Amino acid sequence: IVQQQNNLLRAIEAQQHLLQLTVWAIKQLQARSGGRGGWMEWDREINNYTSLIHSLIEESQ
Amino acid sequence: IVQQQNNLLRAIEAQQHLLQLTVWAIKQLQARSGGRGGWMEWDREINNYTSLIHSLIEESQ
Amino acid sequence: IVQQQNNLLRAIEAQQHLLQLTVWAIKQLQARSGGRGGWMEWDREINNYTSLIHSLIEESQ
C-alpha cells in the first residue's frame, strides 16, 4: 500500500509537469495574436490551481 | 495511509481543474480560426474522459 | 484502502488520456502557423514525461 501511494504520487508529479508544459505552449499560442491582457483572469486561475497542487504535493511528501 | 489517499484525491481534483482550464483555452484558440465543426470528435472524447473522471472522483469520495 | 488506490489509479489514467488529447490539439494549433521545428525540445519533454507516466502506470498495475 505504502509503495503504491508513492507511485501514485510520482504519477501525479509527472502529470503536473505535463500540465505546465501545455500551459506554457498555450500561452505561446495566445501571445501570437497579440497581448495577453484578456487572459489575466485565466492566468490567475492557472496560477492558483498550480499553487494548490504544489502545496498538496509538498504535503504528500 | 487514509489521510495520504485524501491528499492524492485533492491533488487529482485540482489537476482536473487545471485540465479543464487548458481545454477551455484551447477551444478559444481554435474558435479564432473559425467554426469548430472539425473538432466534434475531439470534443466528444474530451467530454467522455471528463465524465469518467467525474464519476471516479465522486466514487472516491 | 486497496479499492481506493485502484480508483485513484483509474482517475490518473483517465486524466492522462485528457492530457494527451490537449497535447494533440495544441500541436494541430501550432502546425497551423507552419513547421513545428521550433517545438522539437517541447516535443522531447512531452514525450519524456509521457514515458515516465506510462512506466508508473504499468508499475502501479
CB atoms within 10 A of CB B47: 10
Cβ-defined contact of C9 to A8 (cutoff 8 Å): yes
Residues with Cβ < 8 Å from C42, sequence gap 6 or more? A21, A24, A25
CA distances from C36 to A5, A20, A33, B6, C33 (A): 38, 19, 17, 41, 9
Q: What is the DSSP letter of A5?
A: H
Q: For residues A52 and B14, is the Cβ–Cβ distance under 8 A? A: yes
Residue that has been written with the C-alpha cell 492557472 in this structure? A46
What is the rounded CA–CA span in Å between residue A58 and residue B43? 34
- CB burial of B22-41 (b: ≥16 within 10 Å; e: otherwise) equals bbebbbebbeeeeeeeebee
What is the rounded CA–CA span in Å between residue B8 and residue C34? 40
Would you state the cell numbers that stand for residue C21, as one nine-digit string? 488529447
Resolution in A: 2.1
Q: Which amino acid type is present at position B43?
A: D
Cβ-defined contact of B42 to C19 (cutoff 8 Å): no
Cβ-defined contact of B12 to C7 (cutoff 8 Å): no
What is the rounded CA–CA span in Å between residue B52 and residue B48? 6
* Distance of residue B28 Cα from the nearest chain C Cα, in angstroms: 11
Q: Which fold has domain A1-61?
A: Helix Hairpins (1.10.287)
* Cα Rg of chain B (Å, integer): 15
Residue that has been written with the C-alpha cell 505504502 in this structure? A2
Structural biology method used: X-ray
* Distance of residue B9 Cα from the nearest chain C Cα, in angstroms: 7
Q: From B7, which residue of chain C is nearest by alpha-carbon distance?
A: C8
Cβ-defined contact of A22 to B22 (cutoff 8 Å): yes
